[PDB]
Design a protein around this ligand. Structure first.
Ligand SMILES: CC(C)C[C@H]([NH2+][C@H]1CC[C@H](n2cc(-c3ccc(Oc4ccccc4)cc3)c3c(N)ncnc32)CC1)C(=O)[O-]
Length: 447
């Protein structure tokens, strides 16, 4: 007997699903990835349910102010998003103390502007919680109610929980290789050398993006072998692969991203107005996704701003990871021109075909420059031969206007001519995540 309660409003989209009215009760039979077999005791109809729409009945996951499964950096981004107020807050699982909790609170002061402060919630040996020893609580709900009545040493009195939206519904079960007829291509979003991108509807019920590869560009068996790896690369800063059509012309079906590529966005009316700290946050989000790719011993091979997508809520997601590996070189693709751009590519990849996570690090440095110039071509005024010969002699793009010196220093480290001298993405992620909050304590040492 394992009982679970619903969280959001969800109704059947497939055949044998159920329905949710923002609060019901369930007993799960078995599990199956993101979909679970559960039995209803409310309406007494039984069908599959999205596991991320429900919560374990004893746990904190029912509470509007608890955010399971998010990082400290996630927490800061979520709280600083528009729509939240002074004292907006969340409780989350602690990142540096397993089993315990952290409180994150939106703060403001005229010197530092909008910030998020973090507090350690300690667990008592015989039950209960505290932030300061003089104020203990039997439950986290009691803690929240206490600090909603007055700051009692915190930066702010707690106001309301961090805003959140209903999560994406999981992709249909057992629907990896799908029939072409299941997709209606609705609007062409982009055209390219080796394919197009469409907004589409899957089985009349789900909005997706579809990359449609040109005939002659890829083999089904070679593509599928790689796509079966790509689909396992799941991370908040990588675009999710939902499905594929494994017949030429090959289609790749992913989540739809409302603001297109980061290059498009930086060149748009809205994106050209992002302030420098937001640009640095974009850079950090991409570094986080590349650190994941690095941890997974994978190689992107074509990292550039045109291959970063931007969501409606301004989350950056890495796209086309690994795809260059399975685009074929033949008479069909040759007639479309250059396979990779010289200006983004590491010298050892150009000269010897040595593509590695370190050549991705080089490309990331070029991407940083694209970001801080809002989409300018790399090496303005220079031809491709000129760039190659200049790099050989120690030339690097100079620091542009409105570029923090430490960001430029990161670029220069990425552009070491020897690959082994370039930093890891783990390193880059750390420096960019902490770019402004360096020389500042992790947690607030409350009395
Ligand atoms: C001003 C603009 C109109 C210009 C336009 N910009 C283009 C920039 C890219 C845009 N683009 C590309 C993808 C995508 C989809 C699947 C995919 O497959 C994958 C394969 C492997 C791994 C992961 C994903 C990879 C990327 C995509 C998406 N999912 N949602 C929204 N926009 C997208 C389309 C406009 C242009 O350049 O024409």
């Amino acid at each position: 007997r394992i009982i679970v309660v619903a969280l959001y409003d969800y109704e059947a989209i497939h055949h044998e699903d159920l329905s949710f009215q923002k609060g019901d009760q369930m007993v799960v039979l078995e599990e199956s990835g993101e979909w679970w077999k559960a039995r209803s005791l409310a309406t007494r109809k039984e069908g599959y349910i999205p596991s991320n729409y429900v919560a374990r009945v004893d746990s904190l996951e029912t509470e509007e102010w608890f955010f399971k499964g998010i990082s400290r950096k996630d927490a800061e981004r979520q709280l600083l998003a528009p729509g939240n107020m002074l004292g907006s807050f969340m409780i989350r699982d602690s990142e540096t103390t397993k089993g315990s909790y952290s409180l994150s609170v939106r703060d403001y002061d005229p010197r530092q502007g909008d910030t998020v402060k973090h507090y350690k919630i300690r667990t008592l040996d015989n039950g209960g919680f505290y932030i300061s020893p003089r104020s203990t609580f039997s439950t986290l709900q009691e803690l929240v109610d206490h600090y909603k009545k007055g700051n009692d040493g915190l930066c702010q009195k707690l106001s309301v929980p961090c805003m959140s939206s209903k999560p994406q519904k999981p992709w249909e079960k057992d629907a990896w290789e799908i029939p072409r007829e299941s997709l209606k291509l609705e609007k062409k979003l982009g055209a390219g050398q080796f394919g197009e991108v469409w907004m589409a509807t899957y089985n009349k019920h789900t909005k997706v993006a579809v990359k449609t590869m040109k005939p002659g560009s890829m083999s089904v068996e070679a593509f599928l072998a790689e796509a079966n790896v790509m689909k396992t690369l799941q991370h908040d800063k990588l675009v999710k692969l939902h499905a594929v059509v494994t017949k030429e012309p090959i289609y790749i079906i992913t989540e739809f991203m409302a603001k297109g590529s980061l290059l498009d966005f930086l060149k748009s009316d809205e994106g050209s107005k992002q302030p420098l700290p937001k640009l640095i946050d974009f850079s950090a989000q991409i570094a986080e996704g590349m650190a994941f790719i690095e941890q997974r011993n994978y190689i992107h091979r074509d990292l550039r701003a045109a291959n970063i997508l931007v969501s409606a809520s301004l989350v950056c997601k890495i796209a086309d990871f690994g795809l260059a590996r399975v685009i074929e070189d033949n008479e069909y693709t040759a007639r479309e021109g250059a396979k990779f751009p010289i200006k983004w590519t590491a010298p050892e990849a150009i000269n010897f075909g040595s593509f590695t996570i370190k050549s991705d690090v080089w490309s990331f440095g070029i991407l940083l420059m694209e970001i801080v110039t809002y989409g300018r071509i790399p090496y303005p005024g220079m031809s491709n031969p000129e760039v190659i010969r200049a790099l050989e002699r120690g030339y690097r793009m100079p620091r542009p206007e409105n570029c923090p010196e430490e960001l430029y220093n990161i670029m220069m480290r990425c552009w070491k001519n020897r690959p082994e001298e370039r930093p890891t993405f783990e390193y880059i992620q750390s420096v960019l995540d902490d770019f402004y909050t360096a020389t500042e304590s992790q947690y607030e040492e409350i009395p």
